[PDB]
Amino acid sequence: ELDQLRQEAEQLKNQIRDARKACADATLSQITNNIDPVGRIQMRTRRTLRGHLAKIYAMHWGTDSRLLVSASQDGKLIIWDSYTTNKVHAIPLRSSWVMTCAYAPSGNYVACGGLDNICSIYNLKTREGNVRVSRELAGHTGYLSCCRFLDDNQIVTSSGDTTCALWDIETGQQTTTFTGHTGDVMSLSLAPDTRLFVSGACDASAKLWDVREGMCRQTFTGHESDINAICFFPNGNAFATGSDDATCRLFDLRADQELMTYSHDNIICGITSVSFSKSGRLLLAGYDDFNCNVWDALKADRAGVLAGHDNRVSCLGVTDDGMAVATGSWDSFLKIWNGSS
Amino acid sequence: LSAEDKAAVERSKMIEKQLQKDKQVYRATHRLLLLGADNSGKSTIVKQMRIYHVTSGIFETKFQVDKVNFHMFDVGAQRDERRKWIQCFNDVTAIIFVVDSSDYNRLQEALNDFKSIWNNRWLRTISVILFLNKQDLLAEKVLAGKSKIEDYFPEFARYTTPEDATPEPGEDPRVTRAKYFIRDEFLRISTASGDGRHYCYPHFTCSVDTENARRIFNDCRDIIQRMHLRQYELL
C-alpha cells in the first residue's frame, strides 16, 4: 500500500518536472543581456539608530515610511522616527526572546513574538497614551518566526511547527490553518492585494497559500538548504528566496519555475534577510559576512555592496515609497541607507 | 524650535532615561541557557533552584546568588529541530548542558549533541557548563556490574584513571574510573576545537546537591574574568 502510494507520488513528481521542462524554452539571463546594466551602486548611511541593548532580530516599516518598529532580544520593542531619530515608544516585552515584529498598515497596533510561542499585539492609540497588551494569541507549538498584519482585525503568523495560522484579533482564535511544510517555516511575504502569501520552510521549499481558501497552490524546491528569508515582487506574480547555500533564487508564480540565480564564488555564507525595491529592479540580501549585497534582478550581477555592520545583518526592510533601506544587525545598531546624486 | 518638536524631544529624553535605567538593570543581571535530554535531571535542577530561590515555549527562572541576579531559560515546547532558534542564545552568559551519565546507550547522543553545540558557528564565543548528572545512579550501575561500558565504548578497555583525579574517600575506584572516562571523553571533544575563545566547565552533579547553582555562579564569575582577560589580550 505504502509502496504504491510512493510510486504514484514519484510518477506525479516526474510528470510535474516534465511539464516544467516543456514550459521552459529560454533562460531569463539570455533575453536580459540586451538591457542597459544598472552599474555600480553606492549608498551612504543617512541615519543610525542607537539605544537597543541586545541583537536586533527583526524590523518592519510603517505605511507612511516615517515610523518603524525594531525588536531586540533585550525584551524591548522600540519605535523609531526615521527622520528626526526620535524614539516614539519603548514597549517592554514580557518575553525577552523576540524573533519577529510587525507594524499594522493603519499604525494603530504592533505585533511581536518569539520563543514564547505567543503573539503579543499592543495598541499604540490608547485613550491615555500608555501602551498596553491589547491581545495575546496562543496555539502555536513552535517559536514564532514571522508575523504580518493583513488588516485591523486579522493577522497571519508562522511558527516552527511547520504550520501557519490566521488569527482574528476580536476573537483571538485561529480561523485558517496552513499545513504541508516539513521544515521550520522561517518567513512569509504578503501579496500587494493581500490575497495570497508565499512562505519558505527549512526544507529548501517555498509554498504559496490562499488566505481566504486555505490550501497550497504552488510549491518550489529550487534551493539546496534552509530558506531563511523571502520577499514578494511588487507586481505580485513573482518572489525571491534566500537560503544558507549563499544563493538567492527568483521564482515566478505563473511560470512555476525559478527565474534567476544569484550567487558568486567569493560569497559562501548564508543569507538572512532579502527584500525588493519599489520597482523590483534591485534585490537587497543581507549575508553572514557582516554586510549586504544589492544584486541586479535581471542580469544576476552584484550591483553594489553595503558594508559597515559590525555583526551579521538580521533584518532588511524597504520603505513603501523606496526612500531608504533599513538594515538591522546583531551589533544592536540599525542603519538607514540611501543613495544620492 | 517648534512646540510640537520640543514635546517630541522631551518625550524622547524620557524614553532615553527609561532605557538607561533598563540598561542598568539589564547589565547587572546574567542570562543562562539550559540544555539537555528528556531523561536528564534538568527538571530536578530547575525545581531545586526555584524552591531555594538562591504552547508555553520557554520557561524562565530568576534566582539571586551573592546579591547577583541570574535568569535561567529552559526550552518548554519546541520541536526536535534546534538548528535555528539556538542562534537566539549567542549572547547568553553560559550554557548549562546537563548529561545523564547512567544511560550508556544514550551517552553517544549526548556526546553528539555536545559536539554539535560546541562547534556551532554562532556558539563559538559562548562557554558551556557541563553537568554530569545522576552520579548516584551511575555509581549504582557500575557497582551492579550487569552492564559494562567496554561493549558500548571499546576505548574504556585501554583507559586509565587520571593522576590528577580527586575521588570521594568512600567511593569505589571503578566508579571513579568510569566517571573520569566520561569526563575525558567530553573533554577531548571540547578541546578538539575552539582555540581557547570559549571554555568548558565539567562538574559532577547529584541532581540534589545544593552547591550546583553556586558552582554555576563561580563558573560564570570565571567566565566574566576571562572575558576581561580577553579585553586586555592577557589570554
Epitope: 516539513t182 521544515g183 527549512c202 526544507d203 529548501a204 539546496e224 538548504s225 534552509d226 544558507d244 547555500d245 549563499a246 559562501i268 555564507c269 548564508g270 | 520541536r79 526536535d80 529541530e81 534546534r82 538548528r83 539556538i86 547522543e109 553528539n112 559536539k115 554539535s116 562547534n119 556551532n120 558557528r121 576545537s193
Partner: nanobody
Amino acid sequence: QVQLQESGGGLVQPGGSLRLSCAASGFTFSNYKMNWVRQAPGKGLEWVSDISQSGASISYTGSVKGRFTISRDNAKNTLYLQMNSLKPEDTAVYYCARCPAPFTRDCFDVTSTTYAYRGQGTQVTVSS
C-alpha cells in the same frame, strides 16, 4: 529537488560483508558533509558515522568503530559504506543524511526524526 537514493540491503548472514551505495542529486555533493543514521525496530534514530567534504576527517560511533568504512566519490557523486563482521543487533533501516548548511563543521538535526535532507533508506536484516 534535493534527493538521495539508497541501494543495497536485504538478508545478510552474520559475520559477512555488505556494500551500501547512495546516489545524491539536486545539490553539490562536494560541498556538504555526509552522515549515516540507523533506525532499529522499536528504537529511535542514532548517529553512526560521518565524512567531511574532502574525506580527511572521518568519524564513527563507538558501537561500530573499526567495523564499518564510509567513503565518498565526488567525481561520480556517490557515497559507499562497506560493512564487515555484521551482528544480529545491526538489523535496522539505514538512512543517508546531508549537512543542513554548506561549509560548516557542525551537524545539528541529522538525527532528527523529521529531518528532510535524508533519503528513504534501506532495510538490512542480519539473521542466520
